[PDB]
Amino acid sequence: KETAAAKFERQHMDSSTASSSNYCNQMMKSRNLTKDRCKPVNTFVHESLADVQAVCSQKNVACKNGQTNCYQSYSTMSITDCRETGSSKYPNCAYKTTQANKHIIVACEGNPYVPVHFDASV
């Protein structure tokens, strides 16, 4: 079905945008991240697809799971962290929205070598 690279774009890319306090509530729903369960934590990156793809050629770092295919951006990037609230109950998933400017760390795979997993922000 959906490729890993497409799944990364669906879950994590929002180049279209200044996020509101309801941003995560709307985006987690519209990107199908609340269909089977409320995904607890999810990050959206507001940079261009080209800039995020270029991270796979930037600073190589260890992934949280111990693999060696993670990469940290040389520059900070505009991102939005979505974190499920305590009062969230499926299927009415509820999220706190936090914008930040941080370096991102993604896992890269394949040919062409593209992001397939959002590992962390630092």
SS (H, E, C) 8-51: HHHHHECCCCCCCCCHHHHHHHHCCCCCCCCCCEEEEECCCHHH
Coil, strand or helix at 53: helix
Question: How would you label 75-109 residue by residue, b for 16+ Cβ within 10 Å and e otherwise?
Answer: eebbbbbbebeeebeeeebbbebeeeeebbbbbbe
Check the annotation: does 10 bind a ligand: yes
Check the annotation: does 17 bind a ligand: no
Q: What is the resolution of this structure in A?
A: 1.9
107, 77 contact by CB (below 8 A): no
Which burial class, exposed, middle or buried, applies to 56 when counting CB atoms under 10 A from its CB (0-12, 13-18, 19+)? buried
Active site residues: 12, 117
Q: Is the peptide bond before 40 cis (omega within 30 degrees of 0)?
A: no
The pair of structure tokens assigned to 7 is 């799944």
Check the annotation: does 31 bind a ligand: no
Check the annotation: does 39 bind a ligand: yes
Which burial class, exposed, middle or buried, applies to 3 when counting CB atoms under 10 A from its CB (0-12, 13-18, 19+)? exposed
